[PDB]
Amino acid sequence: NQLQYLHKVVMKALWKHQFAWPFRQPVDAVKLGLPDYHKIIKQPMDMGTIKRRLENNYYWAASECMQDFNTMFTNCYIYNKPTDDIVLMAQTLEKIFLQKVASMPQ
Amino acid sequence: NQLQYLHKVVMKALWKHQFAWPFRQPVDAVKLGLPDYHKIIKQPMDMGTIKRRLENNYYWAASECMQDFNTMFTNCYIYNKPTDDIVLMAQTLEKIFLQKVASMPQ
Ligand SMILES: CC(=O)Nc1ccc(O)cc1
Numbered sequence: 001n002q003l004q005y006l007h008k009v010v011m012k013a014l015w016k017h018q019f020a021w022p023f024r025q026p027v028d029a030v031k032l033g034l035p036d037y038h039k040i041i042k043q044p045m046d047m048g049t050i051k052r053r054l055e056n057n058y059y060w061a062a063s064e065c066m067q068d069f070n071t072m073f074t075n076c077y078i079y080n081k082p083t084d085d086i087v088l089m090a091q092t093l094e095k096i097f098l099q100k101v102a103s104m105p106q
Numbered sequence: 107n108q109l110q111y112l113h114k115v116v117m118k119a120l121w122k123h124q125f126a127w128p129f130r131q132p133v134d135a136v137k138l139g140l141p142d143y144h145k146i147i148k149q150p151m152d153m154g155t156i157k158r159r160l161e162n163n164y165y166w167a168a169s170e171c172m173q174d175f176n177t178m179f180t181n182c183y184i185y186n187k188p189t190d191d192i193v194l195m196a197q198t199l200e201k202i203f204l205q206k207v208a209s210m211p212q
């Protein structure tokens with residue numbers, strides 16, 4: 001029920017959120033012109049990957065899925081400048097993620 | 107039971123962790139020589155404040171306490187350089203926080 005909740009409640013709300021768009025696919029450092037991205041970011045993560053993983057029964061515990069969300073947001077905070085819009089977008093999304101996690105079943 | 111779990115399980119493990127020390131008290135931008143800290147960081151947070159809040163029944167829901175932890179970690183990622191040791195310290199602590207949150211009661 002935990003993973004089903006993360007898929008059907010948490011990911012459903014985040015995926016369609018207006019600020020989701022920069023996070024729905026992996027960062028393409030070449031297309032985005034970010035030559036140092038993978039020098040700085042050790043473990044890339046995005047909602048597209050998390051969504052596919054939920055759909056495919058990839059996770060064993062809710063904790064792993066939660067860690068993936070955390071990694072995605074943290075990468076954003078670490079790589080980007082504090083004043084970048086994407087940082088505010090991540091913050092908004094992460095607050096919702098945490099709120100929903102707080103109501104997750106045991 | 108949620109808030110009691112965050113206090114007696116989550117905060118107990120984080121407080122005494124070896125990487126806790128930079129997070130046990132508010133960032134003193136004057137003493138640490140960080141003149142731009144409060145220009146960049148809008149909502150300061152630390153484990154000392156969270157611990158006092160848990161002790162004093164400040165929180166209404168686990169979500170608020172969780173948000174405070176998140177804010178503390180996010181501030182760290184946003185303000186500091188990616189290669190700073192404190193960033194790795196925050197990451198380690200946040201992973202533990204999330205792991206414990208995953209086993210929190212409803
Ligand atoms: C998730 C993330 O950091 N995305 C991202 C970063 C910089 C940029 O210029 C475009 C997109």
Ligand SMILES: CC(=O)Nc1ccc(O)cc1
Binds near residue numbers: 181192
């Ligand atoms: C929580 C935090 O960012 N602390 C912190 C940042 C920079 C520094 O030089 C010393 C401490």
